[PDB]
Amino acid sequence: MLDPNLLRTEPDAVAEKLARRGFKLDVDKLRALEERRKVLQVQTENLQAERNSRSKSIGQAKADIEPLRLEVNKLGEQLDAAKSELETLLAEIRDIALAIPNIPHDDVPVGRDENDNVEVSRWGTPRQFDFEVRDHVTLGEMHGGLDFAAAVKLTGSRFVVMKGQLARLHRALAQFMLDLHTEQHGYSENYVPYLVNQDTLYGTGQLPKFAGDLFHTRPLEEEADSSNYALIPTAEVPLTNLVRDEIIDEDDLPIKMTAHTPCFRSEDTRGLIRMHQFDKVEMVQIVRPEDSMAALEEMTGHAEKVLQLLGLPYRKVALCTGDMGFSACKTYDLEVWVPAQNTYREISSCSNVWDFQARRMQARCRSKSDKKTRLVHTLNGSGLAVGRTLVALMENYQQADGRIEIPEVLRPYMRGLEYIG
Amino acid sequence: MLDPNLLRTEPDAVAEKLARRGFKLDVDKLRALEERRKVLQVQTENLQAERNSRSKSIGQAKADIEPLRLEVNKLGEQLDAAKSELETLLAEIRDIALAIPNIPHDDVPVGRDENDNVEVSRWGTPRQFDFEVRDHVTLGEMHGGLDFAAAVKLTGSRFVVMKGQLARLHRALAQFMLDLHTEQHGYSENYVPYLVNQDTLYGTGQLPKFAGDLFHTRPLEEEADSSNYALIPTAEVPLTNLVRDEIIDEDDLPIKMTAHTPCFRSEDTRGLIRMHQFDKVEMVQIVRPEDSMAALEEMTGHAEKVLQLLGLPYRKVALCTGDMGFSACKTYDLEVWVPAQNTYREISSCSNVWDFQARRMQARCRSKSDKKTRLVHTLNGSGLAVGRTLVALMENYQQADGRIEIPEVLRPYMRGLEYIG
Ligand SMILES: Nc1cc(CO)cc2ncn([C@@H]3O[C@H](COS(=O)(=O)NC(=O)[C@@H](N)CO)[C@@H](O)[C@H]3O)c12
Ligand SMILES: Nc1cc(CO)cc2ncn([C@@H]3O[C@H](COS(=O)(=O)NC(=O)[C@@H](N)CO)[C@@H](O)[C@H]3O)c12
Ligand SMILES: [Ca+2]
Ligand SMILES: [Ca+2]
Ligand SMILES: [Ca+2]
Ligand SMILES: [Ca+2]
Ligand SMILES: [Ca+2]
Ligand SMILES: [Ca+2]
């Protein structure tokens, strides 16, 4: 959600920044709705006041209360009708306001799509192979460890069954990532629900605009009016909502949280690349408004550190205005080298959300003296998407016979094992 | 599913065994449906034969084919009508057959409910405390590590948010359990889908009878006719279905599999005890029919070994006929000591399923020479339910000030940490 006072004072200036994302803000409709809202708001508050006054006259006349009671009931019917008409108009304003993406920060390069993204840095040298590179699907078949056919039998397309040592390696990657962020990077570990409610989804921006990208669960028989849930598309959703409706003491900031969860989306026909269910170790930071740009560089470095310790070459890319996600104001993507595809592929997206989710959640901070609160800033970043790390690990460390060399940093997580196979 | 030939030859003998569970088999309705099925089956196969013959006469007359074509279309309409009437009757037989629980093995003590279960063994001595025992909810509040209120905000009742060292300890328990079963007990690790289809749910017995105990997801826009999924209530569902429609070489048996998954059910108002989402390390065995009773003792010992290495006192209980789950033919429950409740509480259920799920899945085995296949037997057991292990660990190892002593066997999983707090 953008600042409603910013939409009322500078609508054309806001529409200009949003045009860089390719978003056309309907300024004309927002103005006509807002002018009609002020007319209905005055009419409604006048009815609220006269009804309140007419009912006080009843208690004052108790010292015939029937002619006064009829008037109070007509005023009550008129007030409810005016309140419903007003609420219908407020919901139309909300339908527009809650579908507006975040305003891009000035640091973001202007661009129309992913071909306009700017490479910021590169690390490591892609391996030169002495044989024909096999992809992760072929490697998983050779080991009997990645089985897409069994997952189609159990469920359907875009799911996987991992078996044996490759399932073990996938678990080891998550253990290493969680240990790195909690032991070296200052994040606190969290176990979160994988089903969340509508308030949580509105809070992080998935609702109202991206309902179709979620798996929704039908309400339960015994919780019929309070169980309209959806599976989490990322741990960013439950983690960021932990500060919803909170006033945090600024001394307690930053709040740095991590979690390893499955992620569920219904948004590459072959492999672990774009599945409906995938594991991801997520990093979330809740910070003071002035520290969010520095916290973005810090969190991006925490994700880069995972790729560096694993020996996986990668590139850091600043997303342009046209390639950013809905709630981000600034994003860096990390793209890992994938030898069978001869290119870098996205493995992490690190964003500064500014106060866009804090506005929806009412997440604020305050100094003990300060007579006023302030919205916090929120940030989220993959550190990393675990299945994509397994793809990169398998392809970059494959041997001529298909054996997988286990990166040195993961060997304590595999009981010192050097190779799978 | 029970053997259909056993329901046709010994219906009263089957009804007698099922009566021990408190299940009344409607023998009279099954017989009347089966007699009417034989009438419709003869009438249908006679129509299939005459239609097949009448269409062959068309090709033979190509050497006027209009009087013969009209007859073929009337026969075709009569055959389709007879096939639909027959299929409606087959579905009524299926509605009865697929709701019948498994026949209890003779080893199972006869009983009406859980108060008739038989204690088989006991291990360890419940700790005598020098202070008033705190429950896991109070301990989690003192540490700030178990937060039920935050989970109600994110989702609703019967969910939890774990934070900091207690989330870390919960992860350490799962790591230890998976490492024990894969390193010492011969199980192969699996990563499975957490959403499964209707065939999978019918295969393990959740459908048709227990649909109301599952979270169901609405079909996806782009997969409208192939995405009616449900969240897994246990890893037994995807793991056991890995052998659906397979003929396994008997030399490859036993197939021993383990997985750590969240579990989702909508079946203790306070705590981690009965939540809609809980983690569990599951053990599944697919074995030859003659080895299933020995494999049950082996798998129960693998679950008991977890409690023993963790130093948690427990009791092993043989469930009576009236307290067994739907698909089990024989079950042992392990009940861990819970000091705040002054009793043992269920933490594992280990079952021999016999051929009941193998019948539904068509999972069979064969020796290379053997001219005929045989249904395998399946088994499943908790090793263990992770949140209940955390409950027992917290309460049994709490110190007077609320600190949690980390069991010796988990300390390598916590970087040598001795106490939380
Ligand atoms: N996003 C993606 C989509 C799909 C479609 O179901 C399959 C994937 N399997 C792996 N990912 C990986 O998930 C990462 C994070 O996703 S993101 O939407 O860009 N960003 C977030 O969710 C933020 N909370 C920061 O992590 C991406 O960088 C991608 O590599 C997939
Ligand atoms: N079952 C249970 C139900 C609920 C209600 O949502 C919450 C729970 N939180 C922990 N469990 C634990 O899950 C264990 C296994 O569940 S079972 O249905 O008995 N058996 C199976 O699922 C087999 N596949 C063997 O594991 C039980 O022993 C119980 O301690 C819960
Ligand atoms: Ca501080
Ligand atoms: Ca974001
Ligand atoms: Ca992106
Ligand atoms: Ca063998
Ligand atoms: Ca069972
Ligand atoms: Ca039970």
Numbering used by the authors:
A (entry chain A), B (entry chain A): 1 to 63, 67 to 270, 277 to 430
Study authors write:
For class II aaRSs, the adenine makes numerous interactions with active site residues, with the N1, N3 and N6 all making H-bond interactions with conserved features shared amongst all class II aaRS members. The interaction between the N3 of adenine with the conserved water molecule for class II aaRS enzymes is crucial for the recognition of aaSAs by the corresponding enzymes. It was hypothesized that the flipped exocyclic amine moiety of HMDDA should be able to mimic this specific interaction. However, in the case of SerRS, the base moiety adopts the syn-conformation relative to the ribose defined by the torsion angle (O4′-C1′-N7-C8) of −124°, while the base bound in the active site of class I LeuRS and TyrRS and class II AspRS remains in the anti-conformation. In this specific syn conformation in SerRS, the hydroxymethyl group of the base forms a direct H-bond with the carbonyl oxygen of Met284, and N9 makes an indirect contact with the backbone nitrogen of Met284 via a water bridge. Despite the HMDDA base making some interactions with surrounding protein residues, compared with the adenine congener, the lack of H-bonds mediated by N6 and N3 of adenine with the conserved Glu270 and structural water molecule leads to a detrimental effect on its inhibitory activity. However, in class II aaRSs, two different base conformations were observed, where the base adopts an anti-conformation in AspRS as seen in class I aaRSs but a syn conformation in SerRS. This is likely the result of the distinct flexibility of their motif-2 loop regions. A comparison of ligand-free and ligand-bound states shows that the motif-2 loop is in a relative fixed position (a closed conformation) in SerRS independently of inhibitors binding, while this loop region in AspRS is more dynamic, which has been described in detail in our previous work. While these values reflect high affinity for the target enzymes, the inhibition is 5 to 420-fold lower compared to that with the original aaSA analogue.
The aminoacyl-tRNA synthetases (aaRSs) are essential enzymes playing a central role in the translation of the genetic code and hence constitute a viable target for the development of antibiotics. Based on the structure of the catalytic site, two distinct classes of tRNA synthetases can be discerned. Both classes activate an amino acid in forming the respective aminoacyl-adenylate (aa-AMP) as natural reaction intermediates. In view of their resemblance and irrespective of the class, aminoacyl-sulfamoyl adenosine (aaSA) derivatives are well-known high-affinity aaRS inhibitors, but they lack antibacterial activity due to their low uptake potential. Structural analysis showed the flipped 2-hydroxymethyl-1,3-dideazaadenine base is partially mimicking the interactions of adenine within both series of aaRS enzymes.
